[PDB]
Design a protein around this nucleic acid. Sequence first.
RNA 1: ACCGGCGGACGGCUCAGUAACACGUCGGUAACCUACCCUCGGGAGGGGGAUAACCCCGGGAAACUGGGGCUAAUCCCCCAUAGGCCUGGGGUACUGGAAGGUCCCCAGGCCGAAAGGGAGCCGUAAGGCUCCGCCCGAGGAUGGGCCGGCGGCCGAUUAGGUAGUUGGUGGGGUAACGGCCCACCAAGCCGAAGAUCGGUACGGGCCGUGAGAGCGGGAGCCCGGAGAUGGACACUGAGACACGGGUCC
Lengths: 107, 124, 96, 242
Amino acid sequence: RDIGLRIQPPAEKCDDPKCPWHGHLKIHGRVFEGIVVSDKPRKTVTVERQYYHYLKKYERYELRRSRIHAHNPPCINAKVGDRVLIAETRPLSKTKHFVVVAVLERA
Amino acid sequence: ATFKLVISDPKTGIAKQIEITGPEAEKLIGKRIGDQIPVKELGINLNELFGKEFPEDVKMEIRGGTDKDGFPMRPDIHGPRRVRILLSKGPGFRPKEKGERRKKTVRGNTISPEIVQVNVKLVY
Amino acid sequence: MEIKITEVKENKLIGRKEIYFEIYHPGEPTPSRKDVKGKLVAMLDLNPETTVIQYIRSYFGSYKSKGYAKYYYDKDRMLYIEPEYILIRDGIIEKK
Amino acid sequence: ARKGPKRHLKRLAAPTSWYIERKAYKWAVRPRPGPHNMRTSIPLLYIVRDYLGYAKTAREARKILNEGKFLVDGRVRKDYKFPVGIMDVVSIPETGEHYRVLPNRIGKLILHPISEEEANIKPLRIRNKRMVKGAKIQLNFHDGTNHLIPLSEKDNYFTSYTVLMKVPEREILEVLPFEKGAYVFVTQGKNVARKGRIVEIKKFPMGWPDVVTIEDEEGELFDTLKEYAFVVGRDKPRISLP
RNA sequence: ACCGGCGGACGGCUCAGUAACACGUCGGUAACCUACCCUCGGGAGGGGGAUAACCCCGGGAAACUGGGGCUAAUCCCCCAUAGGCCUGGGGUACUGGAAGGUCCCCAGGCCGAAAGGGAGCCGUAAGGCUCCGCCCGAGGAUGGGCCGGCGGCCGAUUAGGUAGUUGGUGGGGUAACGGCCCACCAAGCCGAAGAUCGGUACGGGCCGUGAGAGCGGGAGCCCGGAGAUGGACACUGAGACACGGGUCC
Ligand SMILES: [Mg+2]
Ligand SMILES: [Mg+2]
Ligand SMILES: [Mg+2]
Ligand SMILES: [Mg+2]
Ligand SMILES: [Mg+2]
Ligand SMILES: [Mg+2]
Ligand SMILES: [Mg+2]
Ligand SMILES: [Mg+2]
Ligand SMILES: [Mg+2]
Ligand SMILES: [Mg+2]
Ligand SMILES: [Mg+2]
Ligand SMILES: [Mg+2]
Ligand SMILES: [Zn+2]
C-alpha cells in the first residue's frame, strides 16, 4: 500500500485507528527525519533533529536542536537510538502533532 | 382606600371612569386578576353610566391596575408585593428592539391599598 | 483671443460630444465663459442652449489657457445627466 | 475586523493587478463576491470609468450601467461591484465593440480587442470534477461556474482540459485536452503572458503541485506550474491573443 | 406616523493589558462556519391566527406604562411533499499523493421548505409579455475559526520546576481537531544549549545615525492584535458576549 510517502510499509499489521498504514489517519504537510531520545510514554516518542544557524554579525555558525513529540504505532514500535521518519497530522493531544511512519536504521 | 375605576363594555368598545371610596372599596381589597364580582353587590348605578339597559345579576372581572407610584400589575406574579425583575415581553415592558431585555419595577396580583387605578370589563 | 480645437470625441452612451480646446491671448485677461461659449458655438454650429463649459484654466507663466466643454443633442438628457451646480454656474438655469 | 466581515478597502491595499492611481484618494471599490477570485479580476466601475473613459464620475457611470449598455459573457450586468476576470468578454453593442480580459507581461489586467464572431465563445479550464445525484457528472470551471454531463461521457473530460463554450446559451462545442504538443498560455507567475507548446510533465510526492516545461516560438524552454498553464489550442491558438 | 424588510459586528478612536502561536514567514485543515454575490439542477399544493396604527377610558412628579374595542401584509403558526442527519449490510461510478469524503441499492429511526408576493403594458374580456422578487440541492467566491515548523529582549545577589501535571484507554462537549472537560490506568513532562520566577514592552513593513561592519528607536501612514471607568455574565443575529444595545457587583 502507498500513502504518498514512497517508502515500504511495515512488516505486520495493527488495529490502531490512529495508524496511517492500517487505520484511518491521514498525513499532510512536512516530513522530518530524526533520532529518538525518549520512548517512556505509551505509544509516544520524542524525536530530535540538529541544524546550524548563521549569525550575521559574527559570520559564524551555532548548532541548534528541534524536539518533536510523535505518535508511535504498535506495528512500528520505535525505540531509543534509531533513525525515524515522521509526518505531520491533525492534532492528537496537547503536544502531539506528528506520527512515525518508518524506521530507517534500527539502533 | 380609594379606587379609580375603568369599566369597559366589551360589546361596545366604550369605557367609563368613576371613583369609588368608602365601605364599597373595602370589599374589593383582596381579589386577584381574573375573578368576577357582581356590580349590584359592589354598588353602582350601572344603567346611568352608559345610558343603556342591562341584564340583571350582571358582573365584572378585574383585568389590571396601576399603583400609587405609577407601576402596573402583573398577572403572573403572586401576592401584593412590588418587585424588580428582568423582562423580555408582556405587561410592563414595551421592547422596541429584537431580543431586548430590561429590568423593570412591577406589582403583584392581589389588590392592595397602594393601588389606585383598577381596570375591569363587564361580563354579562 | 485665438481658439484652437484640439480634440472632438463622440460619446454615444451618454449622448454628447466632448470638446477640448486652447485659447491664445498674450497681454490679455483670461477670457470669460460667455465669450468662449459664443466663439465656440459660432465655430461649430451648435445650439447654445445645450452647450456647457466644464472649465477654463490658466497656467503660471503662459500666454494661453486650456478649456473643456460638452455639447448635448437633447436638452432633457442634459438636465438629467449634468449636475445642478455646473448648469447654474454657466447661466443655463436660475439658482433658487 | 474585531467582530465582523470587512466591507471597505483602502486604495493603498488594493490588488496589484489593477490599473489604479493609489494615492489620489482614500477609498477604492470593494468588489462583490462572484465568478473569479480577488487576484484575477477587477470591478466593472473601473472598466467603465477608468479604462474606457465613457464616464467621468461614479454617478454617471452608474446611470450608464443601469440602462443596460454593458454585457459580460453575453449577459447584462448592472452591478458596479461585479468582478470581471481572465478570459471574459466585455461587449458594448451600442458602439459595436468587444474585448477579452487578459493579464499583462507584468501581471496587470488589460483589454484586448477582438472580432464580433470570436466574442461568442469563452474558453473554460476544468478546475474540478465530481459525481452528483442521479449518477451524473458535474464539471467545475476556473471562473466558478458549473456544467452537467451524462455518465456515458465520463471519459471525454478530465481536470486541466479546456472547454470552448458558446455564451450566453452555455452550449459545449469543443474539448481541448491537456497533453504534449498542446498550445498553452500562462496566466500567473514569473512567466505570465508567455505562450507556447508542452514538452514534458513532472509530478512529486506528498501533494506538491506538478510542473510543466514549455517551448516558445523562438525555441526557448521554460517551466511553470501546471495549474498556471491554460490550454488554448491543439497546435495553433483557437482564440486571438497578443 | 405605525407594522414589516435590510443595515446598525464595517467605518472612526486609543495603546492599558500581553514575553504569548501576539506578530513575521512557509505550509496544513481528508478536523470547520459563512447573510449579501455567481453558475447549474429542481420547487412554490392545502389551511389557520393574532396584533401595532386607529377609537373609549386611564395611571405616574417624571423615566415610563395599564384595560377594552377593531384590522392587514413579503408578519406568525400548522398539514403534505421535496429535503437533511445518525446507524447496520452490499456495489465499486469520482477526485486526489493518499478516502472516516462523493455516487448507486436494501434496512431501523429522528428533524423537516417556500411569498407566484409586488409593479407596468397588450388585455372587451379571457390570458400573455417584460422587470423586481420566495424555498431546496451541488460547487465557487467573500469574510473568518483552528493547527504546525522556523525567526526576533534583560537578570543566577532567581536552580530546580510541574501533579489535569505528561501520555494512554472510554466518553462528553464543540462549527470543528484537541486534557477543551470528565471516569479509569501508568509515571511521565521541562531544565546550566538557562527551566521556573522577576523586569520592561503591543508585533511588523519601516525610521535616525555611520565609509562600511554596526548601534539606537518603533506615536502619526499601511497590515495584524487588543480595549471601551475596573471585575464578572447573557439575549438577538450569518457574524457580538456588542464604544453612541441589555444584567450584577
Ligand atoms: Mg494539496
Ligand atoms: Mg451598535
Ligand atoms: Mg466596531
Ligand atoms: Mg514575565
Ligand atoms: Mg502562528
Ligand atoms: Mg516562541
Ligand atoms: Mg413539515
Ligand atoms: Mg472524540
Ligand atoms: Mg504598555
Ligand atoms: Mg519592541
Ligand atoms: Mg497621535
Ligand atoms: Mg474615559
Ligand atoms: Zn500499523
